[PDB]
């Protein structure tokens, strides 16, 4: 069953998409504390 069909090459985009999701979720974590009536203000 293996050794046939095709083999995945240039796997860097698989890592680039992971690096983009992790970096985007890190920004969403700081704003998450401001959600709802119990949220807090962010001083910048």
């Amino acid at each position: 069953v293996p050794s046939n069909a095709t083999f995945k090459n240039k796997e860097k985009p698989q890592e680039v998409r992971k690096a983009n999701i992790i970096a985007a979720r890190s920004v969403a974590d700081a704003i998450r504390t401001s959600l709802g009536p119990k949220g807090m203000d962010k001083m910048i």
């Binding site: 046939n4 095709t6 083999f7 090459n9 890592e15």
Partner: protein, 518 residues
């Protein structure tokens, strides 16, 4: 989050697979032009002392040139093993292993083949390549005349790729007889190579005897006939006994003069026991002082000092004698015999020449060259030729060379590619096209065609003629049995096995991690 420290280079992606394959391309292209008798030598620029080294062998070129690429270090290690095991073919292993990565690069990129699939493709391909050489091997050891003649044709092939290709006809008999003198011995440390600067390159000869660079100490005559040679390894110069805790307690210097005189009495008593053998010549590997040397003057015994221990084994095999210490017992000790011993001079340095020795188990080769670079090349050229001929006495199977052996293996590879089917057919056929590169590069260094000339050799084998080969002199297809181009079977298996195993190394590396240098 970076788990690795500072200054840590790592490639987890396409940059790694690209750097691994391209790294082997620069290594393969460097030794590519050195393959074949029409190849050219390479120059090495040393970073210290400004010592230039010119060698055609790929083992020295790869080890001298610094390479920081791990993909390059794999091809360097297999060249050092090929030099230390068989003694020849270090360039053919590096080129063949590099071409296996060339055909494997297009399968992963273009054909989209799994890396292990290419590796598993070479597994079934190498089985047909090694079995093809077995049926093509001929054992001539049944006849001593045909076996000795084959040793000459093998030497002509090895010496062709070096600078000796012009005089290789005269040097083929010198390398053939030198192995016949060993009587099946595979040790090359028993043959001494003395390099002499100046004169014609064709003046290199092989004497029967042992040529020693050392000379007699003071009064010993240069030429003497019917001289028995004796070898003593140990002490005999100001004997310290054994333990270092011995001292002389002296009340008055009158007794001290008798204690030192007793040391000279031990010297005279030991030399007196040597004269009981009836020898005209005595040899010590340790240097001999002036007092023990003068004792041989009245006895008519020659004296030789400062002999190297690796030359003692070479000297013991030429004289056919036995190393003798503890002279108290003459019976169990054996001495060597020599017909005539003359001190000659080659160049500025006088030499000690032996002639008419009983045992021929060792010899000494003298070389002549215009420059020291040609001398260093002449020694390495014979070291590669004498190594193959030494292993031929053990394994007597031989295989025709000159592009013939590479194309015969590719015939069996294409047959097994049909029964495998799958996607391995592209990997198995890639091994067959990789075997085409070795005879192709032979024509590239000679300025020939790399397509039509190779096609003539390929179409001739499929017609039922297995004796066809490539002729670089006339640039056409000629018979290898008539031209006398043949190599050892151990060299054929070593190149295929080392390249197949080395190709399975870099194809298994997805990630390259480089620690901070120290």
């Amino acid at each position: 989050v970076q788990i690795f420290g500072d200054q840590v280079t790592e490639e987890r992606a396409e940059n790694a697979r690209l750097s691994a394959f391209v790294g082997a391309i620069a290594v393969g292209d460097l030794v590519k032009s050195t393959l074949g008798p029409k190849g050219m030598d390479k120059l090495l620029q040393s970073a210290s002392s400004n010592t230039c080294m010119v060698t055609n062998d790929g083992a020295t070129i790869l080890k001298s040139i610094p390479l920081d690429n791990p993909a390059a270090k794999v091809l360097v290690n297999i060249s050092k093993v090929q030099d230390d095991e068989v003694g020849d073919g270090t360039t053919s292993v590096t080129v063949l292993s590099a071409e296996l990565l060339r055909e494997a690069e297009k399968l992963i990129d273009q054909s989209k083949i799994h890396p292990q699939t290419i590796i598993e493709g070479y597994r079934l391909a190498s089985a047909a390549a090694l079995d093809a050489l077995t049926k093509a091997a001929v054992d001539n050891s049944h006849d001593k005349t045909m076996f000795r003649e084959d040793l000459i044709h093998i030497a002509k092939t090895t010496l062709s790729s070096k600078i000796l290709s012009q005089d290789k006809d005269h040097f083929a008999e010198l390398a053939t007889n030198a192995i016949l003198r060993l009587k099946g011995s595979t040790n090359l440390e028993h043959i001494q190579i003395i390099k002499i600067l100046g004169g014609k390159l064709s003046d290199s000869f092989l004497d029967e005897g042992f040529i020693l660079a050392k000379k007699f100490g003071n009064n010993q005559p240069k030429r003497i006939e019917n001289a028995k040679i004796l070898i003593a390894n140990t002490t005999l110069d100001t004997d310290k006994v054994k333990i270092f805790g011995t001292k002389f307690k002296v009340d008055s210097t009158a007794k001290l003069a008798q204690l030192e005189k007793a040391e000279r009495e031990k010297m005279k008593n030991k030399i007196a026991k040597i004269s009981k053998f009836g020898i005209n010549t005595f040899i010590n590997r340790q240097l001999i002082y002036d007092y023990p040397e003068q004792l041989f003057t009245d006895l008519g015994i020659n004296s030789i000092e400062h002999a190297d221990f690796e030359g003692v084994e070479r000297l013991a095999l030429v004289t056919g004698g036995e190393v003798v210490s503890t002279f108290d017992e003459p019976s169990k000790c054996k001495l060597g015999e020599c017909d005539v011993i003359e001190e000659i001079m080659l160049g500025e340095q006088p030499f000690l020449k032996f002639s008419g020795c009983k045992a021929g188990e060792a010899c000494t080769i003298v070389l002549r060259g215009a420059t020291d670079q040609t001398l260093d090349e002449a020694e390495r050229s014979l070291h590669d030729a004498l190594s193959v001929l030494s292993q031929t006495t053990k394994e007597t199977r031989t295989v025709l060379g000159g592009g013939c052996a590479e194309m015969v293996m590719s015939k069996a590879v294409d047959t097994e590619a049909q029964n495998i089917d799958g996607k391995k057919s592209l990997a198995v056929e890639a091994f067959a096209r990789a075997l085409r590169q070795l005879p192709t590069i032979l024509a590239d260094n000679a300025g020939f065609d790399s397509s039509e000339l190779v096609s003539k050799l390929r179409s001739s084998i499929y017609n039922g003629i297995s004796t066809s080969g490539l002729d670089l002199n006339n640039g056409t297809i000629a018979d290898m049995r008539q031209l006398g181009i043949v190599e050892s079977y151990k060299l054929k298996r070593a190149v295929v096995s080392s390249a197949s195993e080395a190709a399975e190394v870099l194809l298994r590396v997805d990630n390259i991690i480089r620690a901070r240098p120290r």
